[PDB]
Design a protein around this ligand. Structure first.
Ligand SMILES: NC(=O)C1=CN([C@@H]2O[C@H](COP(=O)(O)OP(=O)(O)OC[C@H]3O[C@@H](n4cnc5c(N)ncnc54)[C@H](OP(=O)(O)O)[C@@H]3O)[C@@H](O)[C@H]2O)C=CC1
Ligand SMILES: NC(=O)C1=CN([C@@H]2O[C@H](COP(=O)(O)OP(=O)(O)OC[C@H]3O[C@@H](n4cnc5c(N)ncnc54)[C@H](OP(=O)(O)O)[C@@H]3O)[C@@H](O)[C@H]2O)C=CC1
Ligand SMILES: Cc1cc2c(cc1C)N(C[C@H](O)[C@H](O)[C@H](O)COP(=O)(O)O)c1[nH]c(=O)[nH]c(=O)c1N2
Ligand SMILES: Cc1cc2c(cc1C)N(C[C@H](O)[C@H](O)[C@H](O)COP(=O)(O)O)c1[nH]c(=O)[nH]c(=O)c1N2
Lengths: 359, 359
């Protein structure tokens, strides 16, 4: 099975091609993770996935999506991840982390608590920042403050500090969150970036925040550990061919800047879109990015059907298959996939206290 | 769905009829549980089961099955369970524990490390005790030492101390392990008990260790928390009708002695048997015990098929359905079962950070 072939990137070897993508849990307090996360991550790692990327973790307090989001903006926050890192490793999986800044989508309620921007009278709220003072709209109507050059410098340094902290906590894999309409994505998109300085307008300028952030992180993140990013390569906004072309060019520049792998996603920069949701619908997009930018890729959405994951690898549409919600449903999904694909000794996808009894 | 109706016994209310029966993990060291157990139990509890009975936990070191078995033979051992109790409760499940003494099946290797008696030349082993100096046979050839009257008093007191510790650690449900050929079962069975004193021979004498241990535990275990036992009611040894009759009479005496529920199982006292393994094969036997002894019951073996669990409840064969190996395969099996049986808002079998996204 292609899905259960190991994968080596820099000094890291994954035991199979199953990655658990970052999935916000909204259970942290003042950015500090706790026993929710400890059990959540350890259980999934024991389930057999070769790579576990920890949820979007804010590089600064205002960069959280919600009051429940994890943060790594201080050494205390980073130390809280050490038991998570070590439990993932103990399980034979590789611990990664996505570091993030929610931009204009920040200061929002938890998804099961309204999922909308926090009211101005609610003491939990905070001022959001973005390339330009323009709201997402719909359920996220808060207008962000437009960043100054000083803000841009500060946020880049926050990403740097976060990467250093992630390194020291023992993460072996880092992912810069440049997707899903948050700060990085919003600098790239003309929808959200109306700047007239060096960080807006042209393709070079819109790319600049992302390339400078990558370059600054590259300086402190070890050369022998995978340096990756998630990036929305189209919006399904009627501008897809031009947007894909630009995004793929940016992926070439990421590779020139030392990126080892790109997690290919959708922009979600604005609500006025028409996304053709379906099983494995990103497969062909990811394949094009992989082939044209000549960079390893992963992608997600609907690959919880093991045959779809296997087919995507056999078609060389991606190098790792990210399986998200199916792991929330079943933390041992990797074992389920091994059985479904007829892997020899499938139960030993799991540790011995389970594997012995399930064979 | 009958499977998702709550159940009240004494002061304890279970959110559904799904019980996770005790399952040895063989991952403890010197009886002390650790991170293996913490994540294992917390994850399954979050999966939705209404009751989680912690694995066979030895009341004394020589009562472990293996060098990896959990113990509760000191206050420090009990304190180690507190985080497990707390995690199970935090998930909305009810924490139970099975307290045990392996008798002549003690001093064995872990199942994936031979599953056989530890040899005399191996310092990891220890002398076993039993009602009589007779070996199980097969892969368990070690001849146990026949217990003295002082041994009998000591082991009863070890059960009492274990029950006191379980109580003070916060468990809300206790199960005495009188099944599966271990110490308690071996006192009852004529196969293993050849004693000529007050603890062997007649039905009353063979019952005596079990009834006295129950009575002694009853003194320290709270009246308002379920007091339960697991007991093999037949062996499939060609003596089934006679053994069933006696076992059901003992269950009547358990009831008279304050037992709140009986986990109905098979004796496994000797290897020379012919067990008719099959999906839910214990259903009719459990029903007969339930009806004839007028005690609530649970049972196990094959109920991981949700329709079988549901059918057993609707037929009033069981009050709780024990689902073991399916929870090793999938710690969220209760959610899987809710979906399969068409439960309304099935995803909210799980906590919010999963449930929200799985609707
Ligand atoms: N930190 C992050 O990057 C986060 C990413 N997400 C992703 O954002 C995606 C789009 O958000 P949303 O606008 O809710 O899309 P929806 O999740 O609303 O669309 C999901 C499907 O369900 C139904 C409709 C659609 O077909 C979600 O599907 C989810 O995968 C969600 C939360 C946080
Ligand atoms: N602490 C305890 O009470 C323990 C109980 N058990 C139970 O003991 C039962 C019998 O042991 P075993 O004879 O190995 O059962 P097995 O199921 O291993 O032997 C029967 C199998 O043979 C063939 C089918 O597959 C069946 C096991 O099925 C298991 O459920 C297993 C380990 C510890
Ligand atoms: C609960 C939850 C939380 C998040 C997500 C989604 C869900 C369900 N996703 C998106 C996720 O990584 C993935 O791309 C999608 O879930 C699609 O893959 P599946 O169809 O679920 O396998 C996500 N994406 C990301 O880049 N960072 C994150 O922190 C989050 N958080
Ligand atoms: C890994 C493992 C470990 C144990 C068990 C079995 C297995 C698989 N079982 C028996 C268990 O509780 C249950 O009765 C059987 O597994 C049958 O139910 P399932 O078919 O697995 O749902 C068990 N029984 C018991 O009374 N105390 C225990 O500690 C153990 N330990």
């Amino acid at each position: 099975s292609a899905l259960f072939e190991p994968y080596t990137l820099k000094d890291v070897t994954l035991r199979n091609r199953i990655a658990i993508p970052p999935m916000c849990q909204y259970m942290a307090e003042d950015g500090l993770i706790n026993d929710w996360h400890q059990v959540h991550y350890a259980s999934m790692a024991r389930g057999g996935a070769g790579l576990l990327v920890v949820e979007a973790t804010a590089v600064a307090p205002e960069g959280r999506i919600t009051p429940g989001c994890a943060g790594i903006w201080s050494d205390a926050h980073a130390q809280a991840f050490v038991p998570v890192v070590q439990a993932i490793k103990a399980a034979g999986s590789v611990p990664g982390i996505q570091i993030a800044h929610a931009g204009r989508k920040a200061s929002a309620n938890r998804p099961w608590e309204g999922d909308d921007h926090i009211g101005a009278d609610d003491a939990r709220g905070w001022e959001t920042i973005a390339p330009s003072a323009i709201a997402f709209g719909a359920h996220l109507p808060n207008v962000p403050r437009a960043m100054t050059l000083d803000d841009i410098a500060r946020v880049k340094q926050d990403f740097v500090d976060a990467a250093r902290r992630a390194r020291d906590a023992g993460f072996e894999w880092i992912e810069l969150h440049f997707a899903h309409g948050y700060l990085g994505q919003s600098f790239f998109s003309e929808h959200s970036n109306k700047r007239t300085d060096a960080y807006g307008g042209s393709f070079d300028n819109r790319s600049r925040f992302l390339l400078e952030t990558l370059a600054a992180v590259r300086e402190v993140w070890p050369e022998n550990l995978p340096l990756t990013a998630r990036f929305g390569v189209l919006e399904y906004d009627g501008r897809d061919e031009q947007t894909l072309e630009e995004s793929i060019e940016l992926a070439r520049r990421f590779k020139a800047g030392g990126l080892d792998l790109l997690s290919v996603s959708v922009g979600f920069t604005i609500p006025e879109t028409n996304i053709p949701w379906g099983p494995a619908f990103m497969g062909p997009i990811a394949e094009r990015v992989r082939r044209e930018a000549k960079l390893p890729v992963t992608s997600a959405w609907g690959f919880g059907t093991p045959q779809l994951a296997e087919a995507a690898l056999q078609a060389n549409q991606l190098d790792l298959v990210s399986v998200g919600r199916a792991h929330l449903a079943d933390p041992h999904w990797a074992y389920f996939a091994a059985k479904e694909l007829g892997v020899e000794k499938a139960s030993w996808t799991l540790p011995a206290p389970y594997a012995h009894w399930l064979e």
